[model samples]
Target: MTHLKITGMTCDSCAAHVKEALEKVPGVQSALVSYPKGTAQLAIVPGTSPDALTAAVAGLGYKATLADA
Candidate 1:
């Protein structure tokens, strides 16, 4: 499990898009986005680098930073 603190997620659509973006990564098993909370809960495979994940989220027009494991 990985926890990310995402910024600019203002509504449900933003949350949905973020979840979809994470799901596109091959090793990602599941994604949950909390807009009000500004956090993402991800279940992903081993060896998925946080750098890669950060880049992916950034590509979706949001700022995401690793918060905790």
Candidate 2:
């Protein structure tokens, strides 16, 4: 499990988008993005790279950082 603090998400649609984006990555098993909390929770397979996760969200036009390693 990983928590990412993300910006640029304003509504449910944004949260859904973030979830969709993360789902596209190979290592991700689940993604839950919260607009109200401005956070994303991802369940990934072990050994997933932070860079890959960041790039996935960035491609969706959100700024994201791993809050916990």
Candidate 3:
């Protein structure tokens, strides 16, 4: 599992949007976004670039920083 510290998530609905975006990345198998915790966690495939995860969240108008695993 990898962690993403998400900014711009104002509610559970915001987390849901971020979650939807993250899971759509090519190498992302599963994801959980939390508004209360202000972060996201996910399992990713080998060789998946962390930037891809960031980009997906960015596309949804959120800032997602890759956390140290």
Candidate 4:
């Protein structure tokens, strides 16, 4: 599990979108996005790079910064 600070999420739909995007990454097993908290919790497989997670979020026009594991 990894926690990420996410920016630019304005509503439930945004959270859903971010969740979908994160889960699309090959190494991501699951994701939960919170619009109110501006955060994402991810279940990622071993060897999944943080950079890959960040880039996946960025592709959707949002920002994602890894939080302390």
Candidate 5:
């Protein structure tokens, strides 16, 4: 599992939308998004690209970056 830092979410459904988008990505197994925390905890298929995850979120006009440490 990994965390993605996300921005521009206005409510819980925003988190839901992000989760929907993320889990749809080819290499993503699932996504749990938190609006208040502004982050997404992701379970990805092995060798999944973090860049693809971020890009998937960005498609909804949100900003996403891989969390470090």
Candidate 6:
């Protein structure tokens, strides 16, 4: 699992879009995106790259970075 801090999500629809973007990644199994919290918790297949996940968010016009462990 990976926790990501996402920027530019202002509504539930934004969160839904973020969720869809992350889930569409090849190795992502699921994505739980929270608009209010500006975060995404992701379930991913082994060997998934963090950069890949970040790019997925970026593709939707948002910013994504790894949250502090």
lDDT of 3 by residue, 1-69 (tens): 477787766478878877777677667787777688887876788788777777777777877778854
Q: After superposition, how far is residue 47 of candidate 4 from its true place, in Å?
A: 0.6
Taking the tens digit of each residue's C-alpha lDDT, what string does model 4 give over 1-69? 477887666477877888887787777888877788777878899788776787788778977787744
lDDT of each: 0.79, 0.78, 0.75, 0.77, 0.78, 0.76
Where is the poorest 10-residue window by lDDT in model 2? Answer: 1-10
TM-score of each: 0.84, 0.80, 0.79, 0.80, 0.80, 0.80
Q: Stretches of candidate 6 above 4 Å error?
A: none
Report the C-alpha lDDT of model 5 over 1-69, residue by residue, as the tens digit.
Answer: 478887767378878888888777777787977777877888898788777787777878887788744
Q: Over the stretch 1-69, how does candidate 1's per-residue lDDT look in tens digits?
A: 478878766467877787888898899998877887777877878789866787788887878888874
Name the regions of candidate 5 deviating beyond 4 angstroms.
Answer: none
Off by over 4 Å in 4: none
Question: Candidate 4 deviates by what RMSD?
Answer: 1.9
Per-residue error (Å), model 2, residue 48: 0.9
User: Mind sharing the TM-score for model 3?
Assistant: 0.79
Worst 10-residue lDDT window for candidate 3 reads 1-10
True lDDT of residue 8, candidate 2: 63
Clashing residue pairs in candidate 5 are none
**Residue 7 of model 5, lDDT score:** 72
| Model 4 TM-score on a 0 to 1 scale | 0.80
1 against 5, candidate with superior lDDT: 1
